[PDB]
Symmetry: C3
Subunit: 311 residues, 3 copies
Amino acid sequence: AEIYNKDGNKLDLFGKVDGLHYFSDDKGSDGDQTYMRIGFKGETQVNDQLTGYGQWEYQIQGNQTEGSNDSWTRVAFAGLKFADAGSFDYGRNYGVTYDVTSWTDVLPEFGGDTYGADNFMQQRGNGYATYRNTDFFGLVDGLDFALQYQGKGDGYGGSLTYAIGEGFSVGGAITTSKATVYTGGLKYDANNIYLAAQYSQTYNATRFGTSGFANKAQNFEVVAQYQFDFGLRPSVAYLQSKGKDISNGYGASYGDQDIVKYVDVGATYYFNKNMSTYVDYKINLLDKNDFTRDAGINTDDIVALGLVYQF
Amino acid sequence: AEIYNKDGNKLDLFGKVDGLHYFSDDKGSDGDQTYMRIGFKGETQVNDQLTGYGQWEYQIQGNQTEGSNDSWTRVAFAGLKFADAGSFDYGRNYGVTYDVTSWTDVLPEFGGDTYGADNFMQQRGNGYATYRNTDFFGLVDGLDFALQYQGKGDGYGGSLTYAIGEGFSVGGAITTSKATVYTGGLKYDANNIYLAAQYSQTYNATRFGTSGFANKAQNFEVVAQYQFDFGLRPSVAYLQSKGKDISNGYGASYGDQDIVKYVDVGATYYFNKNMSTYVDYKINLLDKNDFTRDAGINTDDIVALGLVYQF
Amino acid sequence: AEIYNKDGNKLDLFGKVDGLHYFSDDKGSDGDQTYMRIGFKGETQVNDQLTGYGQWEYQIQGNQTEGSNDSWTRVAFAGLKFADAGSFDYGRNYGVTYDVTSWTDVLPEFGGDTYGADNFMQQRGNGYATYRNTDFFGLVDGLDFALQYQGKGDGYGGSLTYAIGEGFSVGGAITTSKATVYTGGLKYDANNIYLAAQYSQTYNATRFGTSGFANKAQNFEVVAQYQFDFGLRPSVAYLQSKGKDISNGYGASYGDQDIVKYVDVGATYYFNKNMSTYVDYKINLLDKNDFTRDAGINTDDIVALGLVYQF
Ligand SMILES: [Ca+2]
Ligand SMILES: [Ca+2]
Ligand SMILES: [Ca+2]
Ligand SMILES: [Ca+2]
Ligand SMILES: [Ca+2]
Ligand SMILES: [Ca+2]
Ligand SMILES: [Cl-]
Ligand SMILES: [Cl-]
Ligand SMILES: [Cl-]
Ligand SMILES: [Cl-]
Ligand SMILES: [Cl-]
Ligand SMILES: [Cl-]
Ligand SMILES: [Cl-]
């Protein structure tokens, strides 16, 4: 719902209320995961040349019992667009990495996940000062590039997107907080088809489950998806992350073990643009073992069912 | 304030800011209780037959000093209406019990209260999957029935409402998380008159003050109210809850004591639909004693005065 | 963005997203300070004579990492205007003192500060029941006066504003929670000029850094500011607070030391009404010493740069 438009100032005010339930043995899965989002995009125009924006999107849980809060700013930032010289926007905002990682982040419930938000760049973060440049100066059509800075520690980022005309797209991003991480992705967006795959390499994953970081991490994800016309986007997808020599902060070592790996059958049923329902079944592969045990890492297969209502 | 309506999508965005002060000796009463609510109802139509909704209402305190948060999702859920086959809506939502208990929940400040929110069904809760059916299939006019499911533990619910034409209404609901609870209510809604009374019986009340649960609990409430035409709804009301063999979780026992009992004189003065003022005087009866002492249960008479502004 | 107007009910819904970064050695300065505000003013008219309002403005940080909340109700209250007999509004609301203190609270980032919010009156507070009277009964034009009450402990307030025609304004307020505090201010608002200065005297400042209160506190602030016409309001400003015999709650004493003192060079660049950018450089003077050390009081010079986007 875009709620204000007068004198070159547009303000949209989105929200969703997803009521959903997990089913799995792992007792910190099975249960209600209902939550809602309240966000707001914004726009102010001055001039022909430049347009000023500003955005904010919050996630508040509705699974938590009364007297209790669960919530975080998903993003908050404010920027400036200059016509043909792209944009600058400072504040809590998706890492440049996510530019290419996002292509695989499209499953009905689970996905992305190999990185976290505040996983030292790969999804969101704080203090982020991005510059985006779209259509390379009005010069090379279809080629967009972004160069980022993260706050604290320090980090630099770069991402290069290219849809080789058509629906084929190639994806490349490098991110190096101070601990570099790489990323390549491919996506095919055509005749109600969606094929996307991406993977990446890193120095340290740090902030991971509850057990420190490796010295090398190897994450890969891929999904195929069709868009039926009565509304129904059955998605099957696979992703996995592998480790290296990993510390319990102090000592511990845990070594060479899988971090996450699963196949995913999923169906998202779009009623209309504003209401969806979805069913999602995570086919988990990981074996309940010391690494997973101590670090709380989910070893059980789960299946989630949810009724999303947006705006 | 309904803020968007285009193409069969309605979104209303309500809020209230109630500034109010308590007066009583009990030092965790006397004082400011100012708070605000921000909610949003929603609607998307597809088709003749079915309409998709979604709702959310938050209560944030304004009594708390700076650097501090007090807040909870009052409700969050998303559902589906099918024309003549009623509705389904999953998420944080009023227990089916409250269908009939609500009839007595109408006093200017205090009331309801014999149950809490997260009092194992009787008001709100989490994980709730309700089905409502109104006008019994378009067949029996004036007869609505709801059947519920609570999340975790597990629970089942059923509520049957009937306004015997006129303004007379009979109310019946049974709820049994796993610990059954019963409920009958009566309400008379006519010529600016409001007479409502309800009571109920239970297995265990659990989550109560700070001291475990009984083996049998007996709660009853009744209110009469007139609606004067310059705007003024003086309400007098009485309610009370009695206990059984009650544990300090471990041991303790406390036995057969009153849980809450009071008479209530109250006046709600409606200026216009959007601004009210109100005065409310709780005539408490409970005696400050071991049960009440240790369990913090309010034994003092309080009187509250507040200026509500909605939207 | 005023979002509803129908039938004498106006509801405005403001917000800002300020993305800004501090630069200083003090490690609890240098960094991201991004935050957003979401507020809402309201209005309902009934009648010729009286109009009912209600307000709410929240500040949520966007500097905090994910799974984490930072936030407070800036204000929440609801009131009543009677035409020529001014207004009453109860709830979390700026102390009457701030009526005159505010004149110096106008710098691009830092300022005000000699008092805090919940600094026993001088800025915001809880339980506040204000009465404002503007234009002294329609009688003495340009003379407004406010008389306040704070919640808990108890307090009384009074503030007298006068713009001696022109842009010259004289300011006077006294506030005495139970611990009196005084205030005089002067402001000159004319030909794109802004000159304002205020200072005040107190009994106890209490809630200050981390170290109790003095027996006498002496705070003074002054700013000059010009409004260039391409948009640019370079502001230079100076303020300082001095102490008396001050306790670590228990014992400690710390004595006669400066509390805060700095000169401020600042520029606020208004693009259009809805987007600003700003640069601000706090020239701090305080010496890192026992008082400051133990009480965490910022002894370092900082400079902040931010892109605000309102609505
Ligand atoms: Ca493009
Ligand atoms: Ca398995
Ligand atoms: Ca009916
Ligand atoms: Ca009594
Ligand atoms: Ca005036
Ligand atoms: Ca210095
Ligand atoms: Cl919190
Ligand atoms: Cl999120
Ligand atoms: Cl991870
Ligand atoms: Cl509530
Ligand atoms: Cl209870
Ligand atoms: Cl604030
Ligand atoms: Cl201070």
